[PDB]
Ligand binder design. Structure first.
Ligand code: CLA
Ligand code: CLA
Ligand code: CLA
Ligand code: CLA
Ligand code: CLA
Ligand code: CLA
Ligand code: CLA
Ligand code: CLA
Ligand SMILES: CC1=C(/C=C/C(C)=C/C=C/C(C)=C/C=C/C=C(C)/C=C/C=C(C)/C=C/C2=C(C)CCCC2(C)C)C(C)(C)CCC1
Ligand SMILES: CC1=C(/C=C/C(C)=C/C=C/C(C)=C/C=C/C=C(C)/C=C/C=C(C)/C=C/C2=C(C)CCCC2(C)C)C(C)(C)CCC1
Ligand SMILES: CC1=C(C/C=C(\C)CCC[C@H](C)CCC[C@H](C)CCCC(C)C)C(=O)c2ccccc2C1=O
Lengths: 141, 152, 144, 73, 11, 80, 42, 742
């Protein structure tokens, strides 16, 4: 799948709260979550309080990945709405984060590489004396 | 006699303590009417104190320097009933309890769900098992010789 | 912008409060830091002189004023040392300033020169001079 | 426990009478009343509204230890 | 008041 | 960043993938079991160490293991 | 009647009856024999 | 409209459900596999909201539980009355109350415990009681034992009736949901019926029975010669001789010339010199006025007719400067969830109990109560502990509501959302004020101690070196002293003697009340009180506000109200649930209440209570050293804890030995609690593993596998043991000291 873009999407109706972005947003990074709502309805923000999401495409800014994922999973469970979020740096780079293959991770799809697979039982690991005086670790082998 | 102790029927501090306690009781006895119920209660207390002191003296205990009886767990034949005679009795009773419990557990190991029998005891089987502990040493010794006491 | 971690309230953004806060020496931008440091030090020393001369261990003797003034001078010296240490540890020499470059209107503005090694050094020197001057002026006024 | 036992036995021996320990060491109220409460009388009087003496620093360190122990909680 | 106290020591 | 390792005792019940709150794990096809799939952990740098994945794993001992390691801003969960 | 007996066979009720009976036996023994520090029968 | 709606036989009374435990929850009902099951069966016994979801069943269960509680209370009252009737010396105490100690418990003579039957006085031996029941009975007019027997029988009958009513309302006729949600009728009946008619009837009893009998008792007549209460009702001559106004009958009241009733309905105020209590005429007058006010105020809400007011209309139509629309959806929230009502009622009850304690020590309402020091101390301490516990529980139930009963979609409230949207500012300001208050309040004491230890007594914050006087409190005291002359023309004297100025009141050679001075020590202690209260408020408010979600955990609502943690990650996330916040706030509530009761006890023993001589001088119990010795921590440790504990520890071999035994037992339990508070579960599980191996080696392993207690259970056990030990220690110390010296 080709990653999409978020040029000029509007934002939900909110009155403001003290759980928003901080200096880290200006300094390090933040996250942007976009979805599509069929009707104007009231939902609950991760930061605190209640907001209203408009009909059409909706865009929101958050400080951590956990907040984006929690809001997205609430949308999926309760409203049956697909969602996607990116990460934004101060330099303007935009990185696509949620489903990278266009499919949620809970479902298998060919074309996915295996990472961090140990082909042995958890009780076959070597003792720490074997790996002493070297940088590697027993579970790393 | 033993470890520089004095027999309890010969020491003087025992009598002094008895006199002190009796005087303390009689001081409160005087306040009430002689025929009133508190007078009867205090007279009963005085009689109990005197009987206790006489029994302690007659039982052959050994008071110390300060005036209190001292127990001897050494093993001398003159103090069989001080520690050794009661202790054996305890073991007997104690063994009883343990034996009974063990038996009951085995009696419920056969069924598929023993937890229901553990949280809700049954009275018939427990009553059958209870009286088998009266001869616990013999059964325990026979099981130890046979080899069924220890799991394998 | 609602999603920024702040709120707009009568106290936070009021004409009187904004005007008062935008005139304090620590918030001017086009002024070189030395004068602002001098003003801040003068105010702080003149304020600080009082409690030491009033509640010190020698408040009941004839040595109250001198001991209190000396204690205030010591506090000013320690504060100057702390400021110098913070300036050394925080800002680098050749790097540009890290002040915001645009205001609420969005109009671009020159970044403040206080958030730099030389600017902070000038501010600390001015603060030290102003604090010493304020302490001695308060001592002169109180006991003459 | 060990230090309490040693200190009480030796202080009763030094003071002259060994009957106090022999008669009050067999129950816990004896330890609480005849060892701590009885012996704290001079220690808690290091400084008072009337004055102070050379035992003031020991009372101050007593309170300091109490405060640190309570802060650990 | 004596009878009330004696009620406990009847036996 | 912590270290999340998947062992071969897995049976592919998809519980660990659902339990993760940061989208670290995923599933790939496999042939070592009946379900014909296994887990993998590409986005390890996002792991926060909550150990929710280990709580939902039916096995005599867990087939997914999280070892804590050097901490950072993302793994510590700082919002400022 | 079956379920009444079943409930009366539950652990807390059986335990409290057993402990009450044992406490009564101990109390009566201590009342009959006032105080004793040794075993004088033998 | 308003009507009675019931369901016939919703459930059938059967013993089949008793046979199997845990029928309320399916996972409990399955069967026991480990020991944890047992510990769960008691944890969710009264969690009616989680057994089902329908409101009708929850409401019916709540009604039945209330009936059972009422039956238990009635049984307890009947037992107290029967003990007063049978094993007591009430008749001896009636004639000579000053020299006889109340006692209503007698110990058997089984082992050697007969020494607990101390000689209280009046030819009686028994445990002295400090419940204050004897004063209540004397003020009620009871002068015999047959009346107490009849009262006990009536209480037993009422308990039986309450039990039958509970069974009938749960199993035969269960009210429907619409019946419960009719709050207008409930409020009308609770105000006009329960609170108005009850106080009017009590005023009737006081006017008709208590007043003449108490007049005869105060006149010096023997209790056995006073006429029976019904003779006053039957005979008008006796009342006419006692009160001429009754000779006119009820004619004046219907004629609006009520001044004729000024003989036994007065406005004097103050304390009665003979018994050191409030005038009974004033109390009867106050009860009559309260009855009239409550009957008037109980007809405000519209029920089933045209007239009245609507609660929803009042809430919605209220427009103000600061609120705005504000209260709109509050009616549904407060009529749908039980937890919000529980929280509000708990907070109100706790505050009311604390106010009750303050007012009751300030003005003694019963005869011969002020001169009984043990009763006063016990009542004050008990009521304040109860109030603190209730206030603490309110926050826990508010957190429960916020976690499991709050949704912004169906029911939306503007004020709640506005509060939630800026929690950070609230918490930050509360934290700052707590830090500042604690720093100053405790730094003053530390500075006093340090200047004392260095031989510099002239640099203290004391009454001689540097003064901090509570000027506002002194001004209020002076204004209250000057009020009766000008501000209260009707009142003959001051409302209470606590205000500065006036005269000492003493009964039987013992001081009853005198003005209480205020100095630097009172200033410092009040600021410490404020600091502790603020810290407790901060803990509870943070726990309530951050229950749904936080910056660390953005989905704390899914985990629930009671979850130990989230994991070792994020640096560690132990104790983030609101339950842990309640568990933390319990300790601070305990601290604050302990400090307050210590302050009250020392101040009363130092500057109020004491003895008076024939010449006129007053000698207090502790010599009035509170004003100079309470400004240092060493003074609190030496002059209060060390000095006043002599009577507790030296009570062995006497009639107060049980107090010393409890003194030691509470210490043991307090030390025991740290075992659960400090350690962790894994070590205990790993030890139980080896113990279980040793068991299995001998074929005695149980089917219910042993398991170590869960984390939340361990914390709960620790806090329970800690609180019990501390409270028992204070109880034993206070009671022993005040019985011995008072
Ligand atoms: C917690 C509060 C506290 C307070 C108020 C005091 C107060 C006092 N101490 Mg003690 N002391 C304390 C705790 C405290 N102590 C502790 C914990 C210890 C350790 C054991 C000591 C040990 C100690 C020693 C060893 C000595 C004292 C002595 C003194 C005096 C010296 C004060 C001083 O010169 O500095 C005051 C300095 C200032 C710079 C004041 C700053 C605060 C200003 C007023 C803030 C006001 C803010 C403003 C109004 C807010 C809004 C701003 C807006 C207008 C824009 C003073 C009476 C000395 C003495 O003997 O005196 C008789 C002494 O030798 N103290
Ligand atoms: C039912 C009988 C029973 C029997 C035979 C044993 C046997 C044993 N116990 Mg176990 N134990 C039991 C019950 C029993 N236990 C219970 C109920 C508990 C929980 C309180 C424990 C907890 C326990 C611990 C913590 C330890 C042992 C240890 C031991 C061993 C050393 C003896 C001793 O120290 O006793 C210790 C005894 C106790 C602390 C209390 C036992 C008293 C119980 C209440 C009596 C049994 C009554 C039961 C309800 C009867 C029901 C039967 C009825 C329905 C017919 C020994 C193998 C020790 C060890 O490991 O040795 C190797 C040890 O460390 N036990
Ligand atoms: C649990 C077993 C138990 C047993 C074996 C006994 C045994 C005895 N009781 Mg006790 N008793 C008990 C519990 C028990 N009692 C309880 C629970 C109560 C409270 C009601 C009493 C109250 C009691 C009284 C009032 C009397 C006895 C008496 C006696 C004797 C009866 C002949 C005998 C020594 C009688 C006696 O020996 O008195 C001198 C007697 O009059 N008992
Ligand atoms: C509300 C709680 C309550 C409490 C805590 C007590 C407490 C007590 N009662 Mg009282 N009592 C109560 C209500 C209460 N009573 C009521 C409602 C009645 C009327 C039925 C009585 C009638 C009563 C009598 C007739 C006696 C007591 C006695 C006792 C004492 C011994 C009880 C005993 O050992 O049981 C015995 C154990 C079993 C039956 C098993 C104990 C102090 C006894 C007493 O103190 O004698 C000196 C006694 O004789 N009580
Ligand atoms: C004027 C009549 C009236 C009276 C006196 C009361 C009084 C009371 N109600 Mg209220 N209530 C009323 C009308 C009334 N209610 C109506 C119409 C409704 C429906 C809207 C409710 C709804 C209601 C609920 C849902 C609950 C109460 C509860 C209570 C009790 C609180 C406990 C207490 O404060 O101790 C005061 C102590 C005493 C006065 C007890 C003495 C016994 C009284 C006098 C019995 C007579 C009262 C009864 C209403 C009349 C009998 C009816 C029947 C014979 C036909 C108390 C008995 C709570 C309770 O405790 O549960 C049972 C409770 O949960 N009430
Ligand atoms: C006004 C009455 C009141 C009522 C009706 C409720 C109602 C409720 N509470 Mg609340 N609560 C209250 C006051 C009240 N509370 C107060 C004052 C506090 C502050 C401590 C709390 C704090 C609180 C907490 C912390 C929790 C609740 C919860 C609950 C619910 C579950 C009850 C439970 O399962 O216990 C069943 C019964 C027990 C577990 C009994 C425990 C034993 C107690 C603690 C021992 C006391 C010791 C005793 C006095 C000492 C004697 C010693 C001797 C026995 C040897 C229930 C709906 C629970 C919840 O989950 O709600 C859904 C919960 O977690 N409440
Ligand atoms: C026994 C000692 C103890 C002490 C001193 C504290 C201290 C404090 N608690 Mg803790 N706490 C304790 C036990 C203790 N706690 C226990 C047993 C529990 C139960 C688990 C808790 C649980 C707890 C909770 C739940 C909370 C606190 C909070 C607070 C803070 C309140 C603000 C304030 O007053 O601080 C000011 C400082 C003090 C009063 C301490 C004494 C300092 C004096 C003035 C000396 C200063 C000396 C000087 C500066 C030394 C410099 C010399 C050096 C350079 C060499 C404070 C840090 C609250 C908080 O953090 O909110 C603000 C809060 O939320 N505590
Ligand atoms: C003074 C309080 C205190 C007490 C009494 C204990 C007691 C004990 N500790 Mg703990 N502990 C404490 C504080 C305390 N600890 C603290 C502060 C810590 C630091 C975190 C620990 C950490 C700790 C560790 C790490 C270990 C223990 C273990 C033990 C046990 C050692 C064996 C033994 O002594 O048995 C003697 C038994 C008793 C004195 C228990 C009391 C018996 C009661 C009173 C009998 C019941 C009677 C009565 C009818 C009660 C009815 C209740 C009522 C509701 C009806 C024992 C249970 C060790 C262990 O588990 O060994 C097996 C161990 O591993 N403890
Ligand atoms: C102590 C106690 C008790 C007892 C109680 C009692 C005994 C009670 C009583 C009560 C009563 C006894 C009551 C009464 C009431 C009454 C009323 C409430 C009345 C009213 C009236 C009216 C309202 C009137 C009116 C009118 C008028 C004014 C005018 C004309 C017309 C008419 C007449 C209508 C018991 C045991 C239970 C329990 C425990 C405790
Ligand atoms: C706080 C508390 C308490 C106390 C309580 C009390 C003390 C209460 C009381 C209460 C009361 C005190 C009540 C009352 C009520 C009453 C009523 C309810 C009445 C009624 C009446 C009626 C119904 C009448 C009728 C009639 C008649 C008959 C005649 C005329 C006409 C008419 C119709 C009116 C206690 C200690 C327990 C503890 C816990 C808490
Ligand atoms: C002591 C302790 C334990 C172990 C405590 C246990 C196992 C409780 C034991 C309770 C009783 C004594 C066990 C037996 C109860 C039966 C009802 C006994 C029946 C037989 C007769 C005696 C009635 C924990 O599991 C724990 C967990 C988390 C934090 C702290 C701790 C902790 O401190």
């Amino acid at each position: 799948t080709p990653p999409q873009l978020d040029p000029n999407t509007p934002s939900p109706i909110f009155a403001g709260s003290t759980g928003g972005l901080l200096r880290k947003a200006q300094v390090e990074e933040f996250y942007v979550i976009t979805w599509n709502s069929p009707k104007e309805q009231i939902f609950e923000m991760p930061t605190g309080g209640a907001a209203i999401m408009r009909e059409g495409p909706n865009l929101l800014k958050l400080a951590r990945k956990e907040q984006c994922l929690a809001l997205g999973t609430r949308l999926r469970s309760k409203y049956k709405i697909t969602y996607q979020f990116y990460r934004v740096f101060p330099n303007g780079e935009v990185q696509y984060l949620h489903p990278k293959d266009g499919v949620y991770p809970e479902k298998a799809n060919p074309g996915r590489e295996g990472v961090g697979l140990n082909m042995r039982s958890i009780g076959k690991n070597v003792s720490p004396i074997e790996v002493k005086f070297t940088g590697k670790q027993s579970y790393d082998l | 006699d033993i470890s520089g102790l004095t027999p309890c029927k010969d020491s003087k501090q025992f009598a002094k303590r008895e006199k002190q306690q009796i005087k303390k009781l009689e001081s409160s006895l005087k306040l009430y009417a002689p025929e009133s119920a508190p007078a009867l209660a205090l007279n009963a207390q005085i009689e109990k104190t005197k009987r206790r002191f006489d029994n302690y003296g007659k039982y052959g205990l050994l008071c110390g320097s300060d005036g209190l009886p001292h127990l001897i767990v050494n093993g001398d034949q003159r103090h069989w009933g001080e520690f050794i005679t009661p202790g054996i009795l305890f073991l007997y009773i104690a063994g009883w309890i343990g034996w009974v419990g063990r038996s009951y557990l085995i009696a419920i190991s056969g069924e598929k769900k023993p937890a229901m029998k553990e949280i809700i005891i049954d009275v018939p089987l427990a009553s059958r098992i209870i009286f088998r502990g009266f001869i616990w040493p013999v059964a325990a010794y026979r099981e130890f010789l046979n080899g069924d006491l220890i799991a394998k | 912008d609602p999603f920024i971690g702040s709120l707009e309230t009568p106290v936070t953004s009021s004409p009187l409060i904004a005007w008062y806060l935008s005139n304090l020496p620590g918030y001017r931008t086009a002024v070189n830091p030395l004068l602002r440091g001098v003003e801040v030090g003068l105010a702080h020393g003149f304020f600080l002189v009082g409690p030491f001369v009033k509640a010190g261990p020698l408040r009941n003797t004839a040595y109250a004023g001198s001991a209190g003034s000396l204690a205030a001078a010591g506090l000013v010296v320690i504060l100057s040392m702390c400021l110098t240490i913070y300036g050394i540890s925080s800002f680098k020499e050749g790097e540009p300033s890290i002040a915001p470059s645009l205001t609420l209107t969005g109009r671009k503005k020159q970044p403040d020169q206080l958030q730099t090694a030389d600017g902070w050094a000038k501010f600390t020197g001015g603060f030290f001079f102003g604090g010493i001057s304020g302490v001695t002026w308060a001592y002169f006024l109180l006991y003459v | 426990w060990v230090t309490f036992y040693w200190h009480w036995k030796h202080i009763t021996l030094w003071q002259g009478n060994v009957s106090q320990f022999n008669e009050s060491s067999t129950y816990l109220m004896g330890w609480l009343r005849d060892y701590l409460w009885l012996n704290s009388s001079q220690l808690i009087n290091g400084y008072n509204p009337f004055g102070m003496n050379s035992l003031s620093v020991w009372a101050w360190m007593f309170l300091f230890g109490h405060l640190v122990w309570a802060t650990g909680f | 008041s004596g009878a009330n106290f004696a009620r406990a020591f009847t036996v | 960043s912590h270290s999340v390792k998947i062992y071969d005792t897995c049976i592919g019940c998809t519980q660990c993938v659902r339990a993760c709150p940061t989208d670290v794990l995923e599933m790939i096809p496999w042939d070592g079991c009946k379900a014909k799939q296994i887990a993998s952990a590409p986005r390890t740098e996002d792991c926060v160490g909550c150990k929710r994945c280990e709580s939902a794993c039916p096995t005599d001992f867990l087939s997914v293991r999280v070892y804590l390691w050097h901490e950072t801003t993302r793994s510590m969960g700082l919002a400022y | 009647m079956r379920d009444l007996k079943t409930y009366l066979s539950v652990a807390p009720v059986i335990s409290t009856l057993w402990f009450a009976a044992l406490a009564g036996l101990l109390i009566e023994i201590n009342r009959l024999f006032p105080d004793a520090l040794i075993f004088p029968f033998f | 409209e308003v009507k009675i709606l019931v369901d016939r036989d919703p459930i059938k009374t059967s013993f089949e459900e008793w046979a199997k435990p845990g029928h309320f929850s399916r996972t409990i009902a399955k069967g026991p596999d480990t020991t944890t099951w047992i510990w769960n069966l008691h944890a969710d016994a009264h969690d009616f909201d989680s057994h089902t979801s329908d409101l009708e069943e929850i409401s019916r269960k709540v009604f039945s539980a209330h009936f059972g509680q009422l039956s238990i209370i009635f049984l307890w009252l009947s037992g107290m009355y029967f003990h007063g009737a049978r094993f007591s010396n009430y008749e001896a105490w009636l004639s000579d109350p000053t020299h006889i100690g109340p006692s209503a418990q007698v110990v058997w003579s089984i082992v050697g415990q007969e020494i607990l039957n101390g000689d209280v006085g009046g030819g009686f031996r028994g445990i002295q009681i400090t419940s204050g029941f004897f004063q209540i009975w004397r003020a009620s007019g009871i002068t015999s034992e047959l009346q107490l027997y009849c009262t006990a029988i009536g209480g037993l009958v009422f308990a039986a009736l309450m039990l039958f009513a509970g069974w009938f309302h749960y199993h035969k006729a269960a009210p429907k949901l619409a019946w419960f949600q009719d709050v207008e009728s409930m409020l009308n009946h609770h105000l006009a019926g329960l609170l108005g008619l009850g106080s009017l009837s009590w005023a009737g009893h006081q006017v008709h029975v208590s007043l003449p009998i108490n007049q005869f008792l105060n006149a010096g007549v023997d209790p056995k010669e006073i006429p029976l209460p019904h003779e006053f009702i039957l005979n008008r001559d006796l009342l006419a001789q006692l009160y001429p106004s009754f000779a006119e009958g009820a004619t004046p009241f219907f004629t609006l010339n009520w001044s004729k009733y000024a003989e036994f309905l007065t406005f004097r105020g103050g304390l009665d010199p003979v018994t050191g209590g409030l005038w009974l005429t004033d109390i009867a007058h106050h009860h009559l006025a309260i009855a009239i006010l409550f009957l008037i105020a109980g007809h405000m809400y519209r029920t089933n007719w045209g007239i009245g007011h609507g609660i929803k209309d009042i809430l919605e139509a209220h427009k103000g400067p600061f609120t705005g629309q504000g209260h709109k959806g509050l009616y549904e929230i407060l009529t749908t969830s039980w937890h919000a009502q529980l929280s509000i009622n708990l907070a109100m009850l706790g505050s009311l109990t604390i106010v009750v304690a303050h007012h009751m020590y300030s003005m003694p309402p019963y005869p011969y109560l002020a001169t009984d020091y043990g009763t006063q101390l016990s009542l004050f301490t008990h009521h304040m502990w109860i109030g603190g516990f209730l206030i603490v529980g309110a926050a826990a139930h508010a957190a429960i509501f916020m976690v499991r009963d709050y949704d912004p979609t169906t029911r939306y409230n503007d004020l709640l959302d506005r509060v939630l949207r800026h929690r950070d500012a609230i918490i930050s300001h509360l934290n700052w004020v707590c830090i500042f208050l604690g720093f100053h309040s405790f730094g003053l004491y530390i500075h006093n101690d340090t200047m004392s230890a260095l031989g510099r007594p002239q640099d203290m914050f004391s009454d001689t070196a540097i003064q901090l006087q509570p000027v506002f409190a002194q001004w209020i005291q002076n204004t209250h002293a000057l009020a009766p002359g000008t501000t209260a023309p009707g009142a003959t004297t001051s409302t209470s003697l606590t205000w500065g100025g006036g005269d000492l009141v003493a009964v039987g050679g013992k001081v009853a009340l005198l003005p209480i001075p205020l100095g630097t020590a009172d200033f410092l202690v009040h600021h410490i009180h404020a600091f502790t209260i603020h810290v407790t408020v901060l803990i509870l408010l943070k726990g309530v506000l951050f229950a749904r979600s936080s910056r660390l955990i953005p989905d704390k609502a899914n985990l629930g109200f009671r979850f130990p943690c989230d994991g070792p990650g994020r640096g560690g996330t132990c104790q983030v649930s609101a339950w842990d916040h309640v568990f933390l706030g319990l300790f601070w509530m305990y601290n604050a209440i302990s400090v307050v009761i210590f302050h009250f006890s020392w101040k009363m023993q130092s500057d109020v209570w004491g003895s008076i001589s024939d010449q006129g001088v007053v000698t207090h119990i502790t010599g009035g050293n509170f004003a100079q010795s309470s400004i240092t921590i060493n003074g609190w440790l030496r002059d209060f804890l060390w000095a006043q504990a002599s009577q507790v520890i030296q009570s062995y071999g006497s009639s107060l030995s049980a107090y010393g035994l409890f003194f030691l037992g509470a210490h043991f339990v307090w030390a025991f609690s740290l075992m659960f508070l400090f350690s962790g579960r894994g070590y205990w599980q790993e030890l139980i593993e080896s113990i279980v191996w040793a068991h299995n080696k001998l074929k005695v392993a149980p089917a219910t596998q042993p398991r170590a207690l869960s984390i939340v259970q361990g914390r709960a056990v620790g806090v329970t043991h800690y609180l019990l030990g501390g409270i028992a220690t204070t109880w034993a110390f206070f009671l022993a000291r005040i019985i011995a010296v008072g």
